[PDB]
């Protein structure tokens, strides 16, 4: 609804959009909606980010750009390369955190050597 444009406009009034969004949702703010949930044969590997959907039975796959705060808010990405890590790819998200796909990716990091979500797949 108009609440997406509200929180998306809010992260335009801050120097730290990640913490801005996370503080907003943690205080009861309405999670960002309209993320592009894909339909997948839940027989994937389970890695965090993949070129094709890789959801397990405990996962859901989203279009990468739709779950990236910097893509959705049309603000500059923080990556040193300037390339978004999600855009053009697919992002797997635990089924329990589907209520807020954007805040989950802002709250977690894939394992460097392992590529699975630390705490949600990584076994190193």
């Amino acid at each position: 609804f108009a609440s997406n444009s509200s929180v998306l406009s809010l992260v335009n009034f801050t120097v730290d959009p990640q913490k801005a969004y996370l503080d907003f949702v943690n205080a009861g703010g309405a999670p960002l909606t309209n993320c592009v949930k894909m339909l997948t044969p839940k027989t994937g590997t389970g890695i965090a980010i993949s070129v094709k959907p890789e959801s397990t039975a405990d996962q859901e796959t989203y279009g990468g750009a739709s779950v990236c705060l910097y893509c959705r808010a049309h603000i500059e990405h923080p990556d040193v390369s300037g390339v978004c890590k999600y855009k053009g790819k697919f992002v797997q998200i635990p089924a329990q955190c589907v209520r807020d796909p954007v805040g989950f990716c802002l709250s977690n990091t894939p394992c460097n050597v392992c590529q699975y979500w630390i705490g949600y797949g990584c076994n190193c």
Partner: peptide, 16 residues
């Protein structure tokens, strides 16, 4: 309203 679900399906469908 602001997204492109069909393009994502194309990404899921087409070669990498």
């Amino acid at each position: 309203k602001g997204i492109a679900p069909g393009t994502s399906v194309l990404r899921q469908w087409l070669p990498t």
